[PDB]
């Protein structure tokens, strides 16, 4: 698709080998080796810690990674953050730069979830870990210096899917209150049969074949069948009423373009307040892979600004 | 729920006397008298001129209003601008401030069409006047100091519908080349039956009842029937292939929300480059009516920036 891709995004596609989910163990080991080569500096304005918190009943405690301002004088809003990786890869540490940016620009506390991964822990384990982390965050607002009426949830890709699912689950459980959801370019349609999901086939970071493998591992082979609940695949939701204010965005060359457009359309029809941005010439994860690109800098500034505006509004 | 309107947009909406299209002749006479009580915006960096250009067979001359930089030392891109007004109101002069902004920020020549209005001149008259203006603009690029490979078209509301229609018509006629289309919150679906159209019924600048009247006058009572060509109502297009790079945006509380989302989706599926922004809490024409509002300033800067980016790239 070379001619369709923004020129500032092309060079990074050649710079890294196409992702492979035929060997998930090997892919995770490779990503962890990459992570060790690229360690962030300490940012002196943001204090980062890990904590073990009670998990879902009869399940392991959940690790969360907490980012807070070095100086707290007044009560702050909160953001639950959920990393991506197809439901099968990833760790909170991968998103330290962005979480530190949300703390500094939104003046908030971020709690990032180390959810269990598929295929070892399929649905509902990853979502229940996110829900346990949200319960802990709401319960500990005293100690964190947070306002429980100003907690939102956000994430990218599979983490965006878990964000949209968690907003539905917390609504349905009269669960902790959420003031905002930011399901960025979210993996929400297990059927993998939208035109955009079918069209994106090659080395464009995420594609139809990767999506098929991630959904198969998350849903233990029930992907695409009638035996998939709304909380596993939010595209299946028919009742989107009484969900939180939503910000999302997607690149037009992301396989998730069409499911994202459809979710936005249905949220608006359900009376949910939505801001949505479709970016031209842009593939999945463009803004994380190409930080120097003008379109990446516009996209990052806008969704950091959404967190700042919505979590702090009167 | 008026609580869903952005607080910065509320005060102008209560001062807005609700539009009445039961007597279009009386409404135009009123708007022209209002215009005469206020001097038109001038700008020392922009030179404004009026020209009569050959029209369709129907209307041998069409007036265009031309905005250019005071200092032209190189070849510039061009923007054909199409004002809004429901197909039944308006004149180029109403958009002088925004056309001057495109000249100054995009460093372009703007040609704004004084198209014939419905119901006196129903479809196809308004679109054929725009097409005649585009033919003249392409023909006179050497005289205007414009690059024929860098001409776009843009407009708002009914002008956005004419923009989308003119991109289809120029494609179909192998008509002058367009490098960009900017059909902002465009009036493109004559059926007036989308969920967003039925949702927006009150005093929110444009609504279901006004939309029915504008379409009935533009299409001489054939609105909603099988007797409506794609060039009269671009929502009817099934072939969106080979259309120019598109920017569009819409407020969530605009009746055009759903038809705008659906056209964006179909453009992307046809392989057209598209940027789209949905703004929360925002009604039709918010950014023109509320220049002080933060969401207005973001929206205006983004679509002025799209003109600048797309007309000057490569
Ligand atoms: Mg299948």
Numbering used by the authors:
A (entry chain A), B (entry chain B): 1 to 314
Passage from the reporting paper:
Here we determine the structure of a novel hormone sensitive lipase (HSL) family IV cold active esterase (EstN7) isolated from Bacillus cohnii strain N1 to understand the basis of cold adaptation. EstN7 is a member of the HSL (or IV) family with a α/β hydrolase fold and consists of a central eight stranded β-sheet surrounded by nine helices. Unlike many esterases isolated from psychrophilic organisms that still have optimal enzyme activity at greater than 20°C, EstN7 is truly cold active with an optimal temperature of 5–10°C with a dramatic drop-off in activity above 20°C. We have previously shown that EstN7 retained function in the presence of up to 30% of various organic solvents, which makes it potentially useful in a variety of applications, such as fine chemical synthesis and pharmaceutical industries. Esterases are particularly useful as they catalyse the hydrolysis of a wide variety of esters into their constituent alcohol and acid.
EstN7 was observed as a dimer in the unit cell, which was confirmed in solution by size exclusion chromatography. The two β-sheets are connected across the dimer interface via an antiparallel arrangement of strand 8 from each subunit to form effectively a single continuous sheet, with residues in the C-terminal helix and helix 8 also contributing. The active site lies at the bottom of the cleft formed by the cap region and comprised Ser157, Asp254 and His284. In both subunits, S157 adopts two distinct hydroxymethyl rotamers with approximately 115° between the two. Electron density that equates to ethylene glycol was also observed in the active site of both subunits, with an additional ethylene glycol found in subunit B. Analysis of EstN7 solvent accessible surface area (SASA) shows that the second helix-loop (residues 23–40) is not tightly associated with the catalytic domain as is the case in related structures but forms a bridge-like structure that reveals additional potential tunnels to the active site not present in the closely related mesophilic and thermophilic esterases. The bridge structure is anchored by M31 and L40 through hydrophobic interactions; the connecting residues do not form any additional interactions with the rest of the protein. The calculated volume of the active site using CASTp is 1026 and 1148 Å3 for the A and B subunit, respectively. Surface electrostatics were calculated using APBS (Adaptive Poisson–Boltzmann Solver) and revealed the surface of EstN7 is largely negative with a few basic patches. Thus, EstN7's cold adaptation mechanism is likely to include dealing with change in water entropy and allowing improved access for substrate to the active site.
